[PDB]
């Protein structure tokens, strides 16, 4: 009573001969990465991603957002290469890297992140909380134009709202201040 | 003339008591045995005699996941490092999928 396997075995692509010539696992991190990469491949037997409920991940949704602008990638890449080459010529940066003391500004990197891959992180955080599942019923979009809203409570600070902040009702009793970049010739509709 | 002695042993009654499909509550022992045969997975704890018991109420599932040994166990460390580039283990794991929620919201008063 022996049944044939319903697919390729995980330890069948290699040969049992000439094992002394093959490169063994010299460390454990490589084996851990191999295991965590093989655990993601769809198998034909009973796996973990089947019984604990996955809400059917293999399912293409519908994008209802704005298309990305047409930007030449080769020009941007060569400009970034020239920039990092001009920045590498400095000796003070080398000394700061050797002395293990080198700090970067937070506002600049925040603005650059919001201008670049900001919308992608906002979309993934919105889909993590299940916003597109309850609002558009599966349909998702990407917020291209950035949005900035800050409440007004005391007299010096502020109460900003980002991608999953926490605002108390006592600090949101009045209408906040919404600020976003826009051109002269387009209307907007705010919904809360 | 009767040289052997001590071969009058008995059965330990070790085996699987709950198969896949039975409604197992919290605390029921899945299977007692020696040596790690069915490694625990999700919501399945262990004891001192290498036993299996459930932690939540639901349906017990038996799947086969990857086996990632602990770095402190040097025996498993060398057993893994002695493997060629592209060798996995894949042992049998026991999982308990929960069905009933751990609580809900109910109205009490109205002031």
């Amino acid at each position: 009573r022996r049944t044939p396997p319903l697919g390729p075995m995980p330890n069948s692509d290699i040969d049992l001969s000439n094992l002394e010539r093959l490169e063994k696992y010299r460390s454990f991190d490589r084996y851990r990465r191999r295991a965590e990469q093989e655990a993601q491949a769809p198998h034909w037997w009973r796996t973990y991603r089947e019984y604990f409920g996955e809400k059917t991940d293999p399912k293409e949704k519908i994008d209802i957002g704005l298309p990305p602008p047409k930007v030449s990638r080769t020009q941007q890449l060569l400009e970034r290469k020239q920039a990092i080459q001009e920045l590498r010529a400095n000796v003070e940066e080398e000394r700061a890297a050797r002395l293990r003391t080198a700090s970067v500004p937070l506002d600049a990197v925040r603005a650059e992140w919001e201008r670049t891959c900001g919308p992608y992180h906002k979309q993934r955080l919105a889909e993590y909380y299940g916003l597109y599942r309850d609002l558009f019923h599966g349909a998702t979009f990407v917020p291209r134009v950035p949005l900035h809203v800050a409440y007004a409570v005391g007299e010096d600070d502020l109460m900003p709202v980002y991608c999953g902040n926490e605002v108390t009702p006592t600090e949101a009793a009045q209408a906040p201040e919404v600020t976003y970049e826009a051109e002269e010739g387009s209307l907007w509709t705010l919904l809360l | 003339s009767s040289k052997n002695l001590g071969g009058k042993s008995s059965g330990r009654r070790q085996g699987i008591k709950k198969m896949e499909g039975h409604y197992v509550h919290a605390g029921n022992i899945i299977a007692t045995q020696r040596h790690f045969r069915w490694h625990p997975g999700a919501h399945v704890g262990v004891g001192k005699n290498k036993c299996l018991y459930a932690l939540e109420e639901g349906i017990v599932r038996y799947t086969k996941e990857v086996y990632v040994p602990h770095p402190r166990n040097t025996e498993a460390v060398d057993l893994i490092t002695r493997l060629p580039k592209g060798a996995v283990l894949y042992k049998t794991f026991v999982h308990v999928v929960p069905a009933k929620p751990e609580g809900t919201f109910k109205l009490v008063a109205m002031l």
Partner: peptide
């Protein structure tokens, strides 16, 4: 199990010679 198609999946000593 021996009769199930997933038989012999946890084998590991056949890939080593030490």
């Amino acid at each position: 199990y021996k009769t199930k198609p997933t038989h012999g999946i946890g084998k590991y000593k056949h890939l080593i010679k030490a």
